[PDB]
Amino acid sequence: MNMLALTIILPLIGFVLLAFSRGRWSENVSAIVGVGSVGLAALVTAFIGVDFFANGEQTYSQPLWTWMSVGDFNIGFNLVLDGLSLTMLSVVTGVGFLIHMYASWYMRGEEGYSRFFAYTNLFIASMVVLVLADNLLLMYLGWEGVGLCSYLLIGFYYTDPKNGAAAMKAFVVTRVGDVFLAFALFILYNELGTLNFREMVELAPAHFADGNNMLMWATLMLLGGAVGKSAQLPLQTWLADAMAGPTPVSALIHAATMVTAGVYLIARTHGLFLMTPEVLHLVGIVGAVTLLLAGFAALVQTDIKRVLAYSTMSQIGYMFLALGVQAWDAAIFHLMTHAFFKALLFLASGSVILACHHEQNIFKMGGLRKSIPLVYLCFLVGGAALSALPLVTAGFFSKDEILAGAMANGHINLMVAGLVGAFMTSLYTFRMIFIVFHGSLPLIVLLILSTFVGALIVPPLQGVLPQTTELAHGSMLTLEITSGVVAVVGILLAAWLWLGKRTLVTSIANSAPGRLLSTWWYNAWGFDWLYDKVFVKPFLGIAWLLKRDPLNSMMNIPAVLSRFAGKGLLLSENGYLRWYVASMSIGAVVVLALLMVL
Amino acid sequence: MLLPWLILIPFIGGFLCWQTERFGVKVPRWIALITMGLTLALSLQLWLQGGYSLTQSAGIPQWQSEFDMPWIPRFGISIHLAIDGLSLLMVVLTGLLGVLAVLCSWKEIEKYQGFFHLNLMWILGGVIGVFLAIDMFLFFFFWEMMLVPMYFLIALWGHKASDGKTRITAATKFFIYTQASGLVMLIAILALVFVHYNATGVWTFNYEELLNTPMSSGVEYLLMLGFFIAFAVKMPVVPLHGWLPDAHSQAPTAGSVDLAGILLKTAAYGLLRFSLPLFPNASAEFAPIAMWLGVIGIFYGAWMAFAQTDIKRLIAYTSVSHMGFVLIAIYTGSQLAYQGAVIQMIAHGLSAAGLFILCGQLYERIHTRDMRMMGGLWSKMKWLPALSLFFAVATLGMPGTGNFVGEFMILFGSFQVVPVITVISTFGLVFASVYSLAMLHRAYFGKAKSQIASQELPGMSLRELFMILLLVVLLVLLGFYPQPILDTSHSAIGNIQQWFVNSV
Numbered sequence A: 001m002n003m004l005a006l007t008i009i010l011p012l013i014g015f016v017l018l019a020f021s022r023g024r025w026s027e028n029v030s031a032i033v034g035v036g037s038v039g040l041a042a043l044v045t046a047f048i049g050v051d052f053f054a055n056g057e058q059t060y061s062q063p064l065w066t067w068m069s070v071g072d073f074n075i076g077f078n079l080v081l082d083g084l085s086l087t088m089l090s091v092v093t094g095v096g097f098l099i100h101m102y103a104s105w106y107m108r109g110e111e112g113y114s115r116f117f118a119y120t121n122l123f124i125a126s127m128v129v130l131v132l133a134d135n136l137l138l139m140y141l142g143w144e145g146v147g148l149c150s151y152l153l154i155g156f157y158y159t160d161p162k163n164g165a166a167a168m169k170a171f172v173v174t175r176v177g178d179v180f181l182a183f184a185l186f187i188l189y190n191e192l193g194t195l196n197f198r199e200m201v202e203l204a205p206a207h208f209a210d211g212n213n214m215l216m217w218a219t220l221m222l223l224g225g226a227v228g229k230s231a232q233l234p235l236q237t238w239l240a241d242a243m244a245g246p247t248p249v250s251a252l253i254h255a256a257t258m259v260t261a262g263v264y265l266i267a268r269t270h271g272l273f274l275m276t277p278e279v280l281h282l283v284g285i286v287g288a289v290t291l292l293l294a295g296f297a298a299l300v301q302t303d304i305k306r307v308l309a310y311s312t313m314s315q316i317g318y319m320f321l322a323l324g325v326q327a328w329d330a331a332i333f334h335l336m337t338h339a340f341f342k343a344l345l346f347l348a349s350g351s352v353i354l355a356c357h358h359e360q361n362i363f364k365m366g367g368l369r370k371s372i373p374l375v376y377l378c379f380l381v382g383g384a385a386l387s388a389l390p391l392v393t394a395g396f397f398s399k400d401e402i403l404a405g406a407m408a409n410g411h412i413n414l415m416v417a418g419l420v421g422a423f424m425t426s427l428y429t430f431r432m433i434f435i436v437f438h439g440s441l442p443l444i445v446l447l448i449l450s451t452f453v454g455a456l457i458v459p460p461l462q463g464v465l466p467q468t469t470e471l472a473h474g475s476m477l478t479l480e481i482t483s484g485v486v487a488v489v490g491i492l493l494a495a496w497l498w499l500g501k502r503t504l505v506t507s508i509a510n511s512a513p514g515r516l517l518s519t520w521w522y523n524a525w526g527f528d529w530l531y532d533k534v535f536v537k538p539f540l541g542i543a544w545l546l547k548r549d550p551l552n553s554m555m556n557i558p559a560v561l562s563r564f565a566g567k568g569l570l571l572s573e574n575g576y577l578r579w580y581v582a583s584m585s586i587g588a589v590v591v592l593a594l595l596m597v598l
Numbered sequence B: 001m002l003l004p005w006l007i008l009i010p011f012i013g014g015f016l017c018w019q020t021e022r023f024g025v026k027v028p029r030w031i032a033l034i035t036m037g038l039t040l041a042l043s044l045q046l047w048l049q050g051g052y053s054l055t056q057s058a059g060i061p062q063w064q065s066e067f068d069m070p071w072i073p074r075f076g077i078s079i080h081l082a083i084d085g086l087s088l089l090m091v092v093l094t095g096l097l098g099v100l101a102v103l104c105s106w107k108e109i110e111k112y113q114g115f116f117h118l119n120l121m122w123i124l125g126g127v128i129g130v131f132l133a134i135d136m137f138l139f140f141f142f143w144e145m146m147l148v149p150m151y152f153l154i155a156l157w158g159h160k161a162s163d164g165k166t167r168i169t170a171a172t173k174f175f176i177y178t179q180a181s182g183l184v185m186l187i188a189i190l191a192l193v194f195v196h197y198n199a200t201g202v203w204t205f206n207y208e209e210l211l212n213t214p215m216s217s218g219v220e221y222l223l224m225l226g227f228f229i230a231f232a233v234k235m236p237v238v239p240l241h242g243w244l245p246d247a248h249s250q251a252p253t254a255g256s257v258d259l260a261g262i263l264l265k266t267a268a269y270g271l272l273r274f275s276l277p278l279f280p281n282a283s284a285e286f287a288p289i290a291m292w293l294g295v296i297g298i299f300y301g302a303w304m305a306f307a308q309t310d311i312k313r314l315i316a317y318t319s320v321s322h323m324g325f326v327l328i329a330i331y332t333g334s335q336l337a338y339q340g341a342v343i344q345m346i347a348h349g350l351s352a353a354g355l356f357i358l359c360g361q362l363y364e365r366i367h368t369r370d371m372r373m374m375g376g377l378w379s380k381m382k383w384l385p386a387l388s389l390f391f392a393v394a395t396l397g398m399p400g401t402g403n404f405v406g407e408f409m410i411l412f413g414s415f416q417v418v419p420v421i422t423v424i425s426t427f428g429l430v431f432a433s434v435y436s437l438a439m440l441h442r443a444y445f446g447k448a449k450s451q452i453a454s455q456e457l458p459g460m461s462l463r464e465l466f467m468i469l470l471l472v473v474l475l476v477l478l479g480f481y482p483q484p485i486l487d488t489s490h491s492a493i494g495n496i497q498q499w500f501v502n503s504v
């Protein structure tokens, strides 16, 4: 498995070739280069996994070179591979290859074809760097490259300024998250003296024996970086606006790479969070609140992609809740399954927006189950996996593992939040499906993987993440029964509300608290307005106030004083001889008086 | 031995460029080309033969090469040149920028091209003399002699779209700022020399002899203040900064003149070389003031850059913010922060040179600099918007470029010393990403906001493309492998840091 660096090099080679080609190549050649780069990365990933399982799941290390060596500051360019890294790398490469093939079919006849595939190749390379890094600075390089490619891909259609504004907002919010992550890096290097994950875990208990404040600061800042990248509380506002990009961009962001980076960051530095239990409980609380707010926002969204955005936010909140209840394996399994069905849902939504030919809200569409039966089937199974349909969907098993972890660690409020979030998840998902639809090889692969066939795949996290506290069989069985009952009740309530003629739904919507709650939850609980008022508006006001460069004028004040003093002094040069004699006598008086005084 | 030739080859080359103009108008550009080729080759030969990676830290003074020749023996003044890792790195950077400036002014067929090349060569020779001189009078002499050709270039060859009055005003403001600050530095130098003469009894302007000077707390503060006023004017440090956007705005339109002398790389070298070793206690006492001035510089430069309708002024304020980062790094006493300052300085030189070259190329394309008059230029050009996108990504501190590497070692060392200024500086990094994305959106994205950007534009020439791609390759290699640069300057940085922290 010594070709571990090829998983970075091949997307990098593809990105460089497709960038310097500048779109002069044919679309077939550009598609071949991009999809072949990601497919060769996926094939090398498959061979790496085969050699990993053949060698007995041994953590492999490939040190390429040394990044920077200044005294004790030794940061190496080393790749690592364990079960978590293999799971993340396989998910990223496989789902990215499927999305690349679908985009090669999808983006035909579009300007910037080579540019699009170069940007996605750089995205894949950046996330492979992120998930293969052995220290925090190389992971930061992959982190910021992932953010940069997100900026380049959200505002892909640069002619529309709305896409550029959305990309700028996404990059600024994720840059605030990366600044929090940088704070975590600074604290961890200042305390432990290293940024390698294994060494930080090893020397964390030996160093924080006397005082344990800076470790909570570092883990809190790590959580801030994670919620910056994973679109969680309080930095979740960028995703819904970032939906302005192309469909494969949205699938690659919400399913495979972008939002899973925070979950991988929390799972990779799990030991430091284990020594800071309050911060881990804060991770769980942030996940619960974010999934609840995302479900409430998705309940009233009028567009398919906005519903999918808040569903992605809710699922990532479920992962964060799983991490907060020390259900790490449940979190990574849900990451895999959510990547599968969210990619399937986004590609099906792109098929819907190709069939509709115009940007329309969900109410204008109706009765689409007969015009597009394959797309309707894909949407139906993606919604069933998202809503955790029992015994047929992998999302059901992932959510059951998450809720079992919530049970076994004594977390009751997080369990209640999870069940409520599952109920509203089924509610908004089948609300969208019943509103829209009543009134191909990547698609086949994601069709299969969204069912229990995806649940057949388990991540090899033994020996990497700690094994969860084991629930009793009766408690696990009644929790599975409760989860299935809640999901079925939510789906049936959505059918009772939106499948027929909407009279109870419109009566609630036409109530004055209906207007208030619909307008509140439509704008993501006012967080976008709050960040506009608290941060954007004073920034713009200070920029407008400072655009005249006041310090430059303050330092130009001596020039004005010199000009005024020179003009005042030139009044003595009136050219009158009698005044010159008078001035000489005045100076004689002044000199004589000064000599007499001193 | 090669240091006098390192200084004199630009001067002799400029004289030959001026005198050989009678053989044709296409002759002096070649003469400047082998002039900077010889200068860069001498710098690289000194790099190869210096053995800088194997050099340990032996304390100030520790020079890899030295030259001494008496100039004014009445005051103990000599042409005293010395090179170590830091000075060699900056001489290599100056030679590379001189090569790029000769290449960027290749198509100028002006009637007085020989004098333009002479002024460019004399500016570069003055900058190299600043980096090499370890005599205080000689250092001040180079520091002030690099200003007259700069003044004449800005005043007489400058931005032809603007009036001559605006160019003369900007050049006069730059000259007054730099020369008044230099005179304050000369007063500090004279007072230090006289104090050393009163303490010991030998006339000497030598930097090695003035290191050990018994000085009261309060005289040392005043001398450090004079040195810091000079360096802060040419750093730039707020509020002594506006000469830099005014000089960048009214510089000649080639863009070579921007790379020649208006790029700031000598003041932080002077702070590391002279302000910290000569006055360690005064610098330690002044460190909170300088670090807060750096914080104010970062935030003020970012807000200034966002509020610009001119792209060249935006790049100038980007330089202001980055140099505020370097100023924070200098007054920390951390070897990690100093090495990060060196990497950030080299990377800022490369990235600012690329941005200024691309802005100049855009100006010969569209004949305007207003970002309100351009938009959607990604579809109208071939190479320029993608390279400008890369350089804007570089200037916001993205990993993969040397800017991130330098500024992150700066922030690591600063947080090891001072946490609060470090966190405010990282919010300044957020602001840097904000203004870089704002300039990218206002310049190359969107629709055409005027008629000059509506039609297709001619592609970039092969020479300009080759030098811009050389800058791109150098920035990427510095980001992914800064280790030769860190090994070159490790001994000098170690000596400066050990002197700063072992005498306070």
Ligand SMILES: CCCCCCCCCCCCCCCCCC(=O)OC[C@H](COP(=O)(O)OCCN)OC(=O)CCCCCCCCCCCCCCCCC
Pocket (backbone or CB within 6 Å): A008, A009, A012, A013, A016, A064, A065, A066, A129, B400, B476, B477, B480, B481
């Ligand atoms: C983050 C992405 C993953 C990294 C790969 C791509 C990075 C960017 C590519 C351009 C910059 C490359 C800089 C390094 C070039 C190789 C030189 C090198 O690193 O030598 C060090 C080492 C040998 O010296 P050693 O003494 O072992 O060093 C350790 C310190 N004592 O050398 C070795 O031990 C051998 C190392 C071989 C590495 C080969 C990598 C080839 C990459 C080709 C990329 C093509 C696209 C480039 C542009 C991409 C976009 C920026």
Ligand SMILES: CCCCCCCCCCCCCCCCCC(=O)OC[C@H](COP(=O)(O)OCCN)OC(=O)CCCCCCCCCCCCCCCCC
Pocket (backbone or CB within 6 Å): A012, A016, A018, A019, A020, A021, A022, A023, A112, A114, A115, A118, A122, A125, A126, A129, A141, A142, A144, A145, A146, A148, B378, B379, B381, B382, B383, B386, B387, B389, B390, B393, B398, B399, B400, B472, B473, B476, B477
């Ligand atoms: C490293 C692994 C990942 C880890 C994270 C890394 C994060 C940082 C990575 C930074 C890389 C650069 C990103 C920003 C610049 C992107 C430029 C771009 O958009 O290129 C596309 C463009 C072609 O697009 P198109 O619109 O079709 O062409 C216009 C013509 N009408 O292309 C062009 O017009 C031509 C190419 C322009 C410049 C491309 C980027 C240059 C820098 C990378 C390669 C450097 C050279 C390789 C060798 C390095 C040294 C060994």
Ligand SMILES: CCCCCCCCCCCCCCCCCC(=O)OC[C@H](COP(=O)(O)OCCN)OC(=O)CCCCCCCCCCCCCCCCC
Pocket (backbone or CB within 6 Å): A555, A556, A558, A559, A560, A562, A563, B169, B172, B173, B176, B177, B180, B181, B229, B233, B239, B240
């Ligand atoms: C932050 C405090 C601590 C640090 C202090 C550092 C001090 C030294 C470095 C800063 C020097 C600042 C110099 C300010 C003036 C620069 C030149 C300038 O702005 O000129 C503008 C103007 C010429 O242009 P224009 O406006 O077109 O006028 C045409 C008039 N027919 O000019 C004119 O019309 C007249 C110009 C007269 C000459 C310039 C003014 C000299 C004044 C004394 C300078 C010495 C410092 C004194 C203290 C400064 C404040 C601390």
Ligand SMILES: CCCCCCCCCCCCCCCCCC(=O)OC[C@H](COP(=O)(O)OCCN)OC(=O)CCCCCCCCCCCCCCCCC
Pocket (backbone or CB within 6 Å): A165, A168, A169, A172, A173, A176, A234, A235, A531, A535, A536, A539, A540, B427, B430, B434, B437, B438, B439, B441, B442
């Ligand atoms: C999350 C809550 C918890 C707190 C954590 C820290 C704070 C995080 C806050 C994140 C807020 C991000 C908001 C980003 C909005 C971007 C979109 C936007 O407003 O776009 C409008 C405009 C577009 O830019 P332009 O290129 O001019 O467009 C051309 C035509 N419009 O864009 C502009 O004009 C530029 C707007 C720049 C906004 C800068 C934001 C700076 C944030 C500083 C954080 C400081 C944190 C510490 C605060 C004190 C704490 C005690």
